[PDB]
Amino acid sequence: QWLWDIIDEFIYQFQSFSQYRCKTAKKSEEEIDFLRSNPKIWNVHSVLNVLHSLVDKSNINRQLEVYTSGGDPESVAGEYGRHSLYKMLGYFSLVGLLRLHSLLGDYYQAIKVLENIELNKKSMYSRVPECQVTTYYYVGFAYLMMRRYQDAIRVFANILLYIQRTKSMFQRTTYKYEMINKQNEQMHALLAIALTMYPMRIDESIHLQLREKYGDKMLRMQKGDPQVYEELFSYSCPKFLSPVVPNYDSVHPNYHKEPFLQQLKVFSDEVQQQAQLSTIRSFLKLYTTMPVAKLAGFLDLTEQEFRIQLLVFKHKMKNLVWTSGISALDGEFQSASEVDFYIDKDMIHIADTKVARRYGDFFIRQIHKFEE
Amino acid sequence: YLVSAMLLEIPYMAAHESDARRRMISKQFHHQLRVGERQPLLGPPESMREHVVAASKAMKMGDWKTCHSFIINEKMNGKVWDLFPEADKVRTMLVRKIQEESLRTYLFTYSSVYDSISMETLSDMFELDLPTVHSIISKMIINEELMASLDQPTQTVVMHRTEPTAQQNLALQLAEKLGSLVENNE
Amino acid sequence: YDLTTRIAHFLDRHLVFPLLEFLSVKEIYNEKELLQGKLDLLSDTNMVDFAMDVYKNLYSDDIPHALREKRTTVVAQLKQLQAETEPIVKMFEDPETTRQMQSTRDGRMLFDYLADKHGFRQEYLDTLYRYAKFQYECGNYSGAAEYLYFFRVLVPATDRNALSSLWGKLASEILMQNWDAAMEDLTRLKETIDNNSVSSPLQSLQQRTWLIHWSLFVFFNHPKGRDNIIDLFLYQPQYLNAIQTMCPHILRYLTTAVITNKDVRKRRQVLKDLVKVIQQESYTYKDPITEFVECLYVNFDFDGAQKKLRECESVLVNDFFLVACLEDFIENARLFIFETFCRIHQCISINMLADKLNMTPEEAERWIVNLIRNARLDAKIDSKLGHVVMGNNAVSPYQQVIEKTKSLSFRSQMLAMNI
């Protein structure tokens, strides 16, 4: 006891508040106008839509960890608790967007992510940074699973640096900030190794201390050490289909293991091919227009012995990261050497630092005129 | 004069946080804060007027004023080794004055000579091929080498780049201070 | 140092079991003779490390090697004199003294398993004394010593017999060329060296040369056994103040472990306060060959370095010990003089390099290639001409300070906005 009875109480309160927000958020603009007028604090009634949602996301899969096959809770959450809040008239505040975020929380938990085009299309409401953080958090995973890491790497850096300017100050997250910070860290660390030496996208989000740590890991993974990939998967496997935390690690019941296997078996087969690609492309494009001698010299590094050196190199070249060609007449391996430049990492900071002066006189000139 | 006017004429061009606070400046602030000087008479000015040219290196001019009128005034005679302590001194004047254009006069010097440098100052080619090699690793100077040809291409460019770094002599001593601010705060 | 106070009254006045000599005048590689001759002074009764001092050169004087060690190895000593036709017939002492023992030792080896199978502490304490006497008399009989110091190890007079019999056992196992039972005894030296003893400088220098003896004749992965042979006793390079420190092959095994088996980022520990100042510099005067390995090398020399380091390596191979720390140390004297150069320089015609380093321009191409994949030599290759440029210099280093000013202050004054 002390877990399941409280879980059932919470679930009942979430279905009750799901029905209350499902009823009076389609036709009625009377209770909404009452809630804008009489209670001056806009905080609590926008808090509820995240506070209840996060513990509901928790309790749903917590129950599903027992009811694995023929699951009630996910069907009760998605179809009745989430879709009822999703497909409605938008509450003209930070409620309408947080209802779409509450559904997208479980829409990401379930690996059925394709409505990223619709979810952002129907989200025509003013993208307040509070909601923008959770937007780029959830939408980021769609671009990560879209296997377009050159585009996906940019998304996670915004949420991981947290320069989005979120100041609440009424426990809105709620109670789980370092978890989201570590999750963005691990997703960014995953995106870093898949492209290096292309990024040059890992200075902003996490700076030179953990950058050097994940940098040494990143070099080891590319050079052929599978321990880094193992760590990268092990630290990220909960972070894909963790509710917030499981119920209780026991030995007697075989139910709790079946979802943990469903979590392990899914996001392993995807990232193992990415880890292979990372080692395929690992080697820097030192030279462009290679002749036959050190073409065979770099065929050795690609894969030798012996049989099937040429076809294996062909397979390693056809990976969307090796643009090259063979001139059979001259015997000339004409390959690319894609490199980038640094210095313009000091361009978005000059504006940030002008607003950092404004930041220097935000709280202090608040004090100043609360002090006079 | 050989551990200060040589070791520390490297960081004295806008990089002050290595200044050893017990040296000749005991007396160098004295026999320079005088409105008139000429051919020196005392010990310390006769141990300075060759030092001041050991800044404008002049192997000739600096060697010629530790052996001017000291062999009466206790330099050569007294150090009970008749001529050899000068053969020591001369060598540590000859050598410690090739380690000078390296550290001072390198601005427009890109292609330089290291055979003629041996002809100028008359030290042994290996006893110059050693310290000219030392000049790079020991003093981490921005100059390149292929010493099968006995040469040192520089490609230094720091002159109006060390000025914005002379802003980081103090732009650090702005943001090196915010490191120390909240040490006290909490 | 601290104990150099106590050294000031001793100054190399040790007392171990082996006393005097090492096989006098040899011809060439003259530094090797005394550096092992002085290990033989404080080590123990070596034994084919003698015949390793033979094969070097020709003269004759293998005569007084181990013939004065008789209590063990009686026949092989009386053999070695008539191996060269030498009538010193005065050798008829052991046929008596060994035959005398039989009736005693018979009673003791049948008190052996009245102590073993019983598990009696006091019937064992009896058998313990009588065999403790025999072990110091002649415990080689190292099969009997391996039977002894495997069970309850302790001796009745708990100091000097568990010193000399165990110390002689460690040696004896090596004289038969057994290693795994020498390696458990190795850790039973790791015991007495750190326990330690009365621990006067006569025992200090003794016990420091002691544990470095089995590190000389490399058998195990002494590449790994280096960290063990170095990090003891206020970890000096030589272990001793005693400026006449003669286990000074220390640096060959320190440089083996950290350059050849590890890699030397990480040269800070190996070079700076392990090589330059006093003790290693006293050895830098002693030894002609492995002077140059840190004399030109501290001068940061370029090609004439690799010249003397190559002439060093050509007689590093003549590390004629139970060697097992050789081609690692040879090819990594080439490796580090390569990486010290490949840290800093402009470029090189690898045809010149190959001519300077005694290989071909083909190997030089493949060799820079295998260092680019190592990511230690940080540069890109020109294809054929062999001019792989080395052009690393810092540009506009403000990026650190730029974001550093708001890495702290911009998110540490948000601390103030919650009140």
For the sheet containing A289-291, what is the strand order? Answer: A289-291, A332-335, A324-327
Q: Does C389 touch chain A (CB under 8 A)?
A: no
Contact of chains C and A by CB distance (3 or more pairs under 8 angstroms): yes
3-state secondary structure of A333: strand
Residue carrying the six token digits 């206790």 = B74
Chain A closest-CA separation from residue C407 CA (Å) = 8
3-state secondary structure of A66: coil
CB contact under 8 Å between C380 and A287, yes or no, is: yes
Nearest CA in chain C to A366: C417
- The span from the CA of C296 to the CA of C306, in Å, is 9
- The span from the CA of B10 to the CA of B104, in Å, is 7
List the chains bordering chain A where 3 or more Cβ pairs fall under 8 Å: C
Partners of B161 on chain C (C-beta within 8 Å) are 396
Partners of A359 on chain C (C-beta within 8 Å) are 410, 413
Chain A closest-CA separation from residue C381 CA (Å) = 6
User: Which residues share a beta bridge with A325?
Assistant: A334
- Identify residue B69 by its one-letter amino acid code: S
User: Which residues share a beta bridge with A291?
Assistant: A332
- Name the E strands within chain A: 289-291, 324-327, 332-335
CB contact under 8 Å between B137 and C408, yes or no, is: no
Going by the DSSP 8-state scheme, the letter that residue C416 receives in this structure is: G
Of C372, C402, C414, the CB nearest to A349: C402
Residue carrying the six token digits 């020991």 = B138
Partners of C342 on chain B (C-beta within 8 Å) are none
Q: Does C265 touch chain A (CB under 8 A)?
A: no
**Chains A, C: CB pairs < 8 Å:** 53
Partners of A355 on chain C (C-beta within 8 Å) are none
Phi and psi based region of residue A171 (left: phi greater than 0; alpha: psi -120 to 50; beta: remaining)? left
3-state secondary structure of C105: helix
- Identify residue A135 by its one-letter amino acid code: T
Method: cryo-EM
CB contact under 8 Å between C347 and B146, yes or no, is: yes
- Residue pair A63/A255 in contact by the 8 Å Cβ criterion: no
User: Angle at the Cα of C254 (from C253 to C259), degrees rounded to 5?
Assistant: 100
Centre a 10 Å sphere on the Cβ of residue A201 and count the other Cβ atoms it contains.
19
Nearest CA in chain C to A298: C369
Chain A closest-CA separation from residue C405 CA (Å) = 10
Residue among C201, C226, C206 nearest C216 (CA): C226
Residues near C382 by beta carbon (within 8 Å), at least 6 away in sequence: A287, C388, C389
- Residue pair C300/B137 in contact by the 8 Å Cβ criterion: yes
3-state secondary structure of C405: helix
- The span from the CA of C194 to the CA of C239, in Å, is 13
Residue among A321, A279, A335 nearest A302 (CA): A279
Phi and psi based region of residue C73 (left: phi greater than 0; alpha: psi -120 to 50; beta: remaining)? left
Residue among C316, C294, C321 nearest C305 (CA): C294
Chain C closest-CA separation from residue B84 CA (Å) = 24
Pick the residue of B144, B149, B176 with the most C CBs within 10 A to test the interface with C by mutation. B144
C210 burial type by CB count under 10 A (0-12 exposed, 13-18 middle, 19+ buried): buried
For residue C16, CA distances in Å to A58, A206, C22, C64 come to: 74, 61, 16, 19
Pick the residue of B182, B183, B186 with the most C CBs within 10 A to test the interface with C by mutation. B182
* Peptide bond connecting A200 to the previous residue in cis, omega within 30 degrees of 0: yes
- Identify residue B47 by its one-letter amino acid code: S
Residue among B138, B164, B165, B141 nearest B153 (CA): B141
CB contact under 8 Å between C303 and B146, yes or no, is: no
